Amino acid sequence: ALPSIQLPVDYNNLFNEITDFLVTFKQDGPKYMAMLQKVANRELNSVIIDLDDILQYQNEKFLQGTQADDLVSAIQQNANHFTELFCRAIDNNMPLPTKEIDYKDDVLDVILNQRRLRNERMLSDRTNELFPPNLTRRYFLYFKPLSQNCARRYRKKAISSKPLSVRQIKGDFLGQLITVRGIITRVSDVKPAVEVIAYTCDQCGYEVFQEVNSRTFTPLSECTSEECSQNQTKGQLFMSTRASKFSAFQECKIQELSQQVPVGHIPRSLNIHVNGTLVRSLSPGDIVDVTGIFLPAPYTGFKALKAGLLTETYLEAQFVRQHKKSDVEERVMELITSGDVYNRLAKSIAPEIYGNLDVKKALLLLLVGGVDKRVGDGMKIRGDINVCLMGDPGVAKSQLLKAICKISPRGVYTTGKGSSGVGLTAAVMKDPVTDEMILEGGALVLADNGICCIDEFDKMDESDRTAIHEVMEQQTISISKAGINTTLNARTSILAAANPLYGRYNPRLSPLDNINLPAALLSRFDILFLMLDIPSRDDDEKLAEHVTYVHMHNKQPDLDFTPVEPSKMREYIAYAKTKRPVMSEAVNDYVVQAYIRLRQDSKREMDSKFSFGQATPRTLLGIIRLSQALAKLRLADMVDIDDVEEALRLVRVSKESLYQ
Amino acid sequence: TVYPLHRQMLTDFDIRNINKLSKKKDIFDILSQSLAPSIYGHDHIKKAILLMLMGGVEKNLENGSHLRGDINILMVGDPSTAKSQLLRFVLNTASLAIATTGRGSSGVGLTAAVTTDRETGERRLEAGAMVLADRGVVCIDEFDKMTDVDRVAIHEVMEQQTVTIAKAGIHTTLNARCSVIAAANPVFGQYDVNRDPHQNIALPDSLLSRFDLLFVVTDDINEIRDRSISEHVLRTHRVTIPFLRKYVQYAKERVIPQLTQEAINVIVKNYTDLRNDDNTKKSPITARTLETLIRLATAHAKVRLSKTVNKVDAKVAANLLRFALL
DNA sequence: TTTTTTTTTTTTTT
Ligand SMILES: Nc1ncnc2c1ncn2[C@@H]1O[C@H](COP(=O)(O)OP(=O)(O)NP(=O)(O)O)[C@@H](O)[C@H]1O
């Protein structure tokens, strides 16, 4: 009956080694003596116990004798018991007072204080087997990995260490603390779980503590307390939810890197649990070096169904290392003194793509946008720059957007399918797995007061079309679907790459012929740049040399420009939206006059032909908002006459490209 | 045990032959001819196929998206072009991948979300056609007859070169990188030759961009040719291929050519020459079609087994695109 | 002593 066999592994002395491991050390007073206090001092919760110092401490325990039994390898070979033992002794040497505990102050702090004071005092009357040590903690324990440059002491092989793929993950890895890397997916929302969980009793009281072991347990009532028990007949008892403790729990799957995988073989995502202070550490779609204890959790069931028992297991979180996490106006002040903020930063836009700085020129207006205005009633006048692209097929205009949202504040990079109607209109898309019927607005909701970036904009169908057809009135998205009648803010900025119908726009053809969009939707944008690709035996040379500059090199540009990086740039771009220019009346009247002949030449050209007229109000609205945009590029707030005129250059330049 | 079957085992004495032949400078054409024992000529198409059989290397950017190196082509022409049967040669020597007649779907290589579970309460995906075809040859009978709805993920198959799955479900984006060749018949009758390529496409539009080559093959009659057409067809019913697979496989992993500027000093002149000329004849022209000059040259670069790209390889490319559009 | 299940294929339909 249960054969039993000796093994070199013994917990007995290792416990002692743990006592000498903590509070006695130097190289990092020591870290284990007063930080432990700072936990007991209640300024910190997570106890970070590094495998690093387990190694360096064995440098103190070997080299530097007397020799000691294995640790980090014994750790990562078992991984679970070392939080039930290495941590259990922590109760012994923990500082008493500690400093300034108060009582309430903190809720339930007085509960447990008076728990054990009423416990000892009700135990004092009986004396005139104790609340388990895991009950009073208020500190989690997190092991962290050793990569390591000092793992090169060396123990060599024993280091994992490596962030192996789940394909690399194996059945002998059960009960082994390891590193794994991969993308976050579906990341279940944080929920409380449970820990002991004291249920009160009805007649003479007392209490009992049901340990929280596994994923589920049997609840119990009866009466345990000897006094309520047997007299009479049995003391009833219920759960006290304020006598309960809950460890933090958020479980999240992490998918494979997909280049870790053999060529066939669909990605295999693995199950992970989060416990403790490391809750909220992980968010959807995030690559990280994640280390943790990997244990089987059968079953519930089913049961006799499985067989063999076929564990199905899971991972628990231990450590998180995440790849890729005024004096700032001074960081801006080489650019402020640089001069040529508008043309230079216009060159700085998408430095990868060659040519058409005239396009980037307006993209510049977009990144800052602004300033809006509020009419005092009020109804917002955008304030938001909706500018569109055109021309085809590739142009890598997608790159313009691709970098823009990557850099421009609160960006959304989208396409026709792409962000759907329900990818743009908040509905009730049933939530997969964890339930139920949650609401996620995509696109126009997701990043608001920021740019939406579209391609395949004609393939958005009508699902997006009528809603965005509203979003040019901006400042809303209405939803009557299901039981929810709200109109939620889409404050989103709009931009699209317009890909004309197959296979390219035809120069003889009248404008809007290439475009498959509604006629009512293109007066809704302010301005648009059509991108024609016309063979020139000159520019296609430098182009093909630009295409052959790959793969020869990595860095494309030279002779000469120095790219302007997003951080420092974004801070001026966010420095500008605060400026809020106010038009002088001189420039205002000038915005009227040339706009009259603008309201004449698009009209006196009559029949559509070139078109479109009329230079509608929205182009004046725009021209004004564009000088409101252009001024912050100057700072000012005084809105120069040429500060208007610079938008005036872009006005016709947008159109009239329809000729070539 | 579970042994796979049909990699391969080259010893020494064999690869010594591989290289002994590799020294010879007409071998490209040679390898091309042996591909179709029955089939007449179409050697330019043959070459194109081998060019797809290498994979044309790859280059992955650092901290950015990859530049696809594998080759995607399509056949078009009147019935009895041997297009389907030609695909069936790419069925065996090619070391995978799997071929399909039109339909096709659901989403082809899309898993289509095995549901529910199977088993023990775990919703599962399973290898789709295109997925199973990762780093292999997808072939299509009647790519013109596939649904317009499939085509969506097909775009996703070629440029994006991956598989996006939202369905139930698991959001994994898994590598779809694949060599893909298909055949389409003239939309309407024998007018493939008479009609413009526009309306002759049968599958617009971005579908056309991703294609490295569109091959129009005429059923047109030459009685002079028809005699030839007959005799070899009759002696049908009445330079070695297996070794060709043993060679191609070796040319994949050893070695990748990288590049030399010599091809570059020419194919550029060639591309602009296309844009200033090929628009006085037909369409289309894009940067992408030039990126194929890279891939094409690189393919023949693996054919020479040269440690590096060389100018004459580019001359092989300049060869192939002419006949591509004329 | 009982456990637990909605996509994908095809269809007939305005
Ligand atoms: N050298 C050859 N050239 C052309 N056809 C050949 C040749 N040798 C044999 N054939 C025969 O020609 C026929 C080719 O048909 P094929 O066009 O490949 O099928 P298919 O294209 O799917 N039919 P369709 O879809 O209408 O074009 C087959 O019967 C082949 O056996």
Side-chain angles (χ1 to χ4, degrees):
Chain A
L2 202 164
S4 182
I5 286 179
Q6 71 167 8
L7 286 183
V9 180
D10 178 32
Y11 294 139
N12 178 32
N13 57 340
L14 184 61
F15 195 60
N16 196 331
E17 171 169 26
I18 289 157
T19 75
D20 284 340
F21 178 95
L22 298 180
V23 162
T24 66
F25 185 68
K26 201 49 186 175
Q27 303 287 329
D28 292 347
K31 187 177 179 55
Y32 301 139
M33 178 168 31
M35 190 182 60
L36 194 161
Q37 186 149 15
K38 282 191 293 291
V39 154
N41 290 333
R42 309 180 291 97
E43 278 106 8
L44 179 57
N45 290 96
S46 73
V47 168
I48 314 266
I49 302 297
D50 48 340
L51 298 178
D52 293 340
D53 190 15
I54 304 169
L55 203 279
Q56 304 268 111
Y57 173 79
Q58 278 175 135
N59 277 138
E60 194 71 15
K61 294 314 283 185
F62 191 65
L63 312 172
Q64 269 71 9
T66 63
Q67 49 184 25
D69 293 332
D70 167 67
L71 291 182
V72 169
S73 308
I75 286 190
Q76 85 181 19
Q77 185 68 267
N78 201 321
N80 178 69
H81 187 222
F82 288 83
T83 33
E84 300 168 339
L85 196 120
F86 175 97
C87 206
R88 80 182 267 259
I90 298 186
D91 181 81
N92 288 337
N93 60 18
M94 179 167 293
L96 37 108
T98 74
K99 47 173 294 188
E100 56 183 345
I101 60 163
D102 306 324
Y103 44 109
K104 154 139 131 59
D105 200 14
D106 179 26
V107 63
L108 187 143
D109 204 2
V110 283
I111 275 182
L112 188 40
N113 207 320
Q114 297 167 348
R115 269 300 160 75
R116 299 182 180 279
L117 204 152
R118 84 182 286 270
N119 170 36
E120 184 186 0
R121 194 183 179 277
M122 291 320 101
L123 189 145
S124 293
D125 292 338
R126 185 185 57 208
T127 191
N128 182 26
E129 301 294 339
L130 190 133
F131 307 167
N134 187 35
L135 189 148
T136 77
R137 300 290 300 266
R138 202 176 160 280
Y139 67 97
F140 292 96
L141 195 147
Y142 296 133
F143 298 102
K144 90 165 55 175
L146 53 93
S147 310
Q148 198 47 64
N149 310 332
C150 68
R152 283 185 178 82
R153 197 61 61 184
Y154 58 91
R155 194 172 165 75
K156 48 187 200 70
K157 311 171 52 62
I159 56 181
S160 301
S161 251
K162 256 156 47 241
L164 50 85
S165 188
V166 188
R167 284 303 173 69
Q168 189 65 76
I169 289 185
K170 183 191 162 49
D172 282 339
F173 295 171
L174 265 193
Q176 291 185 348
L177 174 138
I178 91 163
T179 313
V180 296
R181 69 158 67 181
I183 302 111
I184 305 290
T185 295
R186 157 198 310 181
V187 58
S188 77
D189 264 327
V190 53
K191 301 180 70 62
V194 42
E195 184 55 41
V196 289
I197 299 272
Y199 48 93
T200 68
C201 189
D202 192 44
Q203 327 167 334
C204 291
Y206 304 84
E207 293 303 323
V208 173
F209 307 79
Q210 201 180 8
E211 303 307 325
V212 191
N213 299 326
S214 61
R215 176 68 184 160
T216 47
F217 62 93
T218 176
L220 26 60
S221 61
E222 55 278 354
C223 181
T224 304
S225 62
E226 56 180 354
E227 301 315 319
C228 297
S229 194
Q230 296 99 13
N231 188 31
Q232 182 171 4
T233 303
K234 290 197 182 308
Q236 184 48 271
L237 49 97
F238 306 132
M239 73 194 64
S240 32
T241 53
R242 59 181 170 188
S244 54
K245 178 58 172 186
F246 301 100
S247 42
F249 178 76
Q250 165 154 23
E251 49 186 1
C252 63
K253 308 168 52 184
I254 274 76
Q255 295 167 349
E256 291 163 333
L257 164 60
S258 73
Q259 79 196 171
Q260 283 165 340
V261 190
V263 307
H265 277 190
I266 286 171
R268 170 208 309 281
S269 46
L270 182 128
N271 219 323
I272 310 180
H273 283 189
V274 147
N275 285 325
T277 312
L278 273 202
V279 81
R280 304 191 159 97
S281 166
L282 308 185
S283 245
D286 299 342
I287 281 178
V288 40
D289 297 329
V290 148
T291 65
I293 309 149
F294 175 66
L295 294 194
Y299 196 24
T300 68
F302 327 132
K303 297 175 290 295
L305 262 79
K306 272 76 211 200
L309 237 264
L310 192 59
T311 45
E312 175 273 339
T313 184
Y314 85 81
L315 179 66
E316 164 55 41
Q318 286 311 133
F319 176 86
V320 167
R321 167 188 305 164
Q322 283 179 342
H323 297 113
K324 192 182 57 60
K325 58 169 292 181
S326 187
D327 60 344
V328 199
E329 297 166 9
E330 184 260 345
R331 294 182 183 97
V332 169
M333 271 161 212
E334 308 87 4
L335 209 125
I336 282 183
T337 61
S338 286
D340 192 47
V341 191
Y342 177 82
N343 206 329
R344 167 201 175 134
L345 289 184
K347 173 61 185 307
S348 310
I349 291 146
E352 303 81 358
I353 63 153
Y354 177 87
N356 314 117
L357 180 146
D358 206 318
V359 179
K360 306 171 188 179
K361 221 65 166 290
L363 307 182
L364 191 67
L365 300 166
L366 180 55
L367 296 154
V368 215
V371 199
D372 68 52
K373 192 53 197 170
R374 179 174 172 79
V375 311
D377 316 329
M379 47 206 79
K380 267 80 176 186
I381 53 157
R382 62 173 187 100
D384 195 329
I385 314 267
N386 288 5
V387 170
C388 185
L389 294 192
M390 191 63 61
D392 81 322
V395 182
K397 49 170 101 172
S398 174
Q399 303 310 98
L400 286 67
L401 280 186
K402 203 157 292 176
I404 279 165
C405 299
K406 172 197 314 168
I407 303 67
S408 188
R410 200 53 88 148
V412 201
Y413 172 84
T414 72
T415 171
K417 286 299 160 63
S419 185
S420 316
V422 88
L424 32 104
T425 163
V428 259
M429 61 144 106
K430 172 57 173 61
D431 207 19
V433 196
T434 162
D435 290 316
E436 67 275 30
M437 300 293 295
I438 61 94
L439 278 65
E440 180 75 1
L444 321 174
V445 202
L446 189 59
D448 54 354
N449 200 351
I451 284 71
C452 254
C453 307
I454 317 141
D455 323 280
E456 301 180 7
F457 186 81
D458 322 333
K459 288 76 192 178
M460 74 199 302
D461 325 319
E462 185 259 329
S463 202
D464 325 358
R465 246 184 196 97
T466 47
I468 267 160
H469 161 48
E470 193 283 337
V471 189
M472 308 289 171
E473 198 254 330
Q474 198 47 238
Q475 303 305 330
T476 286
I477 287 181
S478 308
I479 304 92
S480 278
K481 280 183 300 305
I484 309 101
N485 284 93
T486 63
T487 81
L488 49 91
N489 307 10
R491 310 189 294 253
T492 47
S493 321
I494 295 161
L495 194 141
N499 283 324
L501 198 54
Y502 65 95
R504 90 185 46 90
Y505 153 74
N506 187 4
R508 291 175 184 82
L509 270 45
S510 183
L512 185 141
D513 235 331
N514 50 358
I515 309 157
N516 318 119
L517 293 175
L521 181 137
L522 271 94
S523 62
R524 286 188 171 266
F525 313 116
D526 17 32
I527 270 195
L528 187 158
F529 283 1
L530 63 103
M531 301 173 170
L532 34 85
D533 204 10
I534 285 184
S536 307
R537 195 189 276 273
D538 190 30
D539 305 332
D540 301 341
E541 308 296 340
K542 297 164 63 69
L543 167 147
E545 296 165 340
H546 197 279
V547 189
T548 56
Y549 207 91
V550 188
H551 327 327
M552 169 173 68
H553 292 117
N554 273 347
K555 54 145 293 181
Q556 280 133 22
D558 233 6
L559 207 59
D560 83 315
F561 192 65
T562 163
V564 165
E565 77 260 5
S567 22
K568 177 190 297 284
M569 185 172 53
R570 280 175 300 181
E571 201 60 22
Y572 169 84
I573 295 171
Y575 172 42
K577 303 200 57 154
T578 58
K579 275 295 155 300
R580 194 169 284 101
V582 165
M583 259 159 311
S584 45
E585 185 275 342
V587 314
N588 168 23
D589 195 27
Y590 181 96
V591 176
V592 189
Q593 286 167 352
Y595 180 73
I596 292 147
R597 280 165 199 83
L598 186 52
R599 185 60 91 160
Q600 180 194 345
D601 55 26
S602 231
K603 279 179 194 171
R604 70 166 269 293
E605 186 48 41
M606 291 187 184
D607 192 23
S608 188
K609 311 288 285 184
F610 314 149
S611 79
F612 313 106
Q614 313 171 171
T616 41
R618 291 161 190 186
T619 69
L620 195 63
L621 186 153
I623 209 181
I624 287 164
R625 165 194 59 218
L626 289 183
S627 184
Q628 258 163 341
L630 271 172
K632 315 144 52 173
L633 308 192
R634 176 169 296 100
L635 302 185
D637 306 328
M638 324 278 89
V639 189
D640 309 346
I641 192 67
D642 191 26
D643 190 17
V644 174
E645 182 58 41
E646 185 56 35
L648 270 72
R649 185 191 62 88
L650 273 70
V651 175
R652 78 190 51 82
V653 153
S654 12
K655 355 169 53 58
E656 329 316 331
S657 187
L658 28 125
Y659 290 143
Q660 313 288 334
Chain B
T1 85
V2 197
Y3 305 148
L5 61 113
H6 285 83
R7 323 158 173 92
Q8 216 183 331
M9 37 198 83
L10 307 162
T11 59
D12 288 339
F13 188 76
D14 322 344
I15 199 184
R16 209 170 48 92
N17 291 293
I18 272 97
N19 306 284
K20 193 169 66 66
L21 176 152
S22 83
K23 265 55 179 176
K24 325 167 61 172
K25 264 65 182 182
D26 201 35
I27 58 180
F28 181 59
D29 194 27
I30 281 198
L31 306 172
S32 299
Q33 299 175 13
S34 72
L35 301 172
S38 81
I39 309 178
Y40 290 108
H42 295 117
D43 277 356
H44 324 127
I45 306 197
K46 312 291 193 290
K47 296 182 194 289
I49 306 158
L50 214 80
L51 299 189
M52 190 225 40
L53 293 185
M54 289 296 186
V57 200
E58 176 61 25
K59 160 132 180 174
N60 193 344
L61 284 187
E62 184 239 354
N63 100 128
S65 187
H66 63 269
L67 282 60
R68 174 192 65 200
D70 29 338
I71 307 87
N72 288 335
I73 313 100
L74 186 128
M75 265 196 73
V76 63
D78 267 345
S80 70
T81 299
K83 65 205 86 166
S84 302
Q85 182 99 69
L86 180 59
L87 300 206
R88 297 309 184 95
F89 172 76
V90 191
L91 170 123
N92 259 333
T93 79
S95 185
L96 294 65
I98 268 55
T100 61
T101 81
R103 52 216 39 78
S105 281
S106 253
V108 197
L110 270 53
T111 80
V114 186
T115 38
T116 37
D117 315 305
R118 178 70 186 202
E119 60 170 10
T120 79
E122 181 86 357
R123 319 267 306 229
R124 171 157 304 111
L125 312 182
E126 271 178 36
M130 224 77 71
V131 158
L132 219 29
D134 198 345
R135 303 291 215 117
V137 215
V138 191
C139 281
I140 304 142
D141 248 26
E142 321 298 337
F143 186 63
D144 45 15
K145 294 302 191 294
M146 285 170 81
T147 57
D148 36 13
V149 181
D150 196 329
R151 305 188 174 288
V152 190
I154 298 179
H155 291 147
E156 169 83 34
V157 165
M158 332 173 72
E159 215 179 6
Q160 180 57 54
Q161 199 59 91
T162 62
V163 162
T164 66
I165 321 148
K167 200 177 292 192
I170 299 89
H171 289 15
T172 52
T173 310
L174 100 89
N175 286 83
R177 35 178 319 163
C178 292
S179 47
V180 183
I181 266 200
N185 290 316
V187 205
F188 179 66
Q190 71 185 2
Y191 279 160
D192 198 10
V193 195
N194 198 333
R195 175 199 292 172
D196 302 344
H198 313 287
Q199 308 167 323
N200 207 350
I201 292 142
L203 35 107
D205 195 40
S206 173
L207 298 159
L208 290 44
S209 334
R210 322 252 209 272
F211 284 167
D212 296 322
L213 306 157
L214 323 156
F215 279 172
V216 178
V217 200
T218 58
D219 190 83
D220 286 329
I221 95 100
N222 317 112
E223 32 175 8
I224 306 92
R225 281 284 295 182
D226 188 14
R227 177 48 60 104
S228 70
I229 292 295
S230 57
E231 263 123 11
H232 182 354
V233 148
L234 312 173
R235 71 154 96 162
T236 296
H237 287 116
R238 302 176 80 216
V239 193
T240 59
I241 305 177
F243 181 80
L244 185 110
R245 108 180 39 94
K246 262 185 292 293
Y247 170 82
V248 163
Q249 65 176 10
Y250 170 67
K252 307 161 51 176
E253 99 261 359
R254 305 168 188 182
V255 204
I256 79 106
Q258 296 93 14
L259 175 149
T260 41
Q261 193 175 11
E262 305 319 301
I264 272 57
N265 297 131
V266 171
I267 66 197
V268 164
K269 173 196 70 60
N270 217 294
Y271 173 69
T272 61
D273 177 27
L274 312 178
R275 273 187 87 88
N276 309 126
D277 254 13
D278 188 52
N279 259 151
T280 52
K281 286 82 177 178
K282 284 195 307 304
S283 289
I285 290 292
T286 69
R288 182 172 301 253
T289 65
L290 171 146
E291 303 170 356
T292 71
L293 302 174
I294 307 168
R295 287 191 200 102
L296 276 50
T298 325
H300 183 291
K302 275 194 195 167
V303 181
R304 186 177 297 159
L305 253 67
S306 174
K307 186 60 183 196
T308 52
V309 159
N310 212 318
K311 186 181 83 166
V312 180
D313 299 311
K315 297 294 175 57
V316 188
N319 217 336
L320 249 241
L321 198 128
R322 293 293 188 283
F323 182 83
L325 255 47
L326 283 89

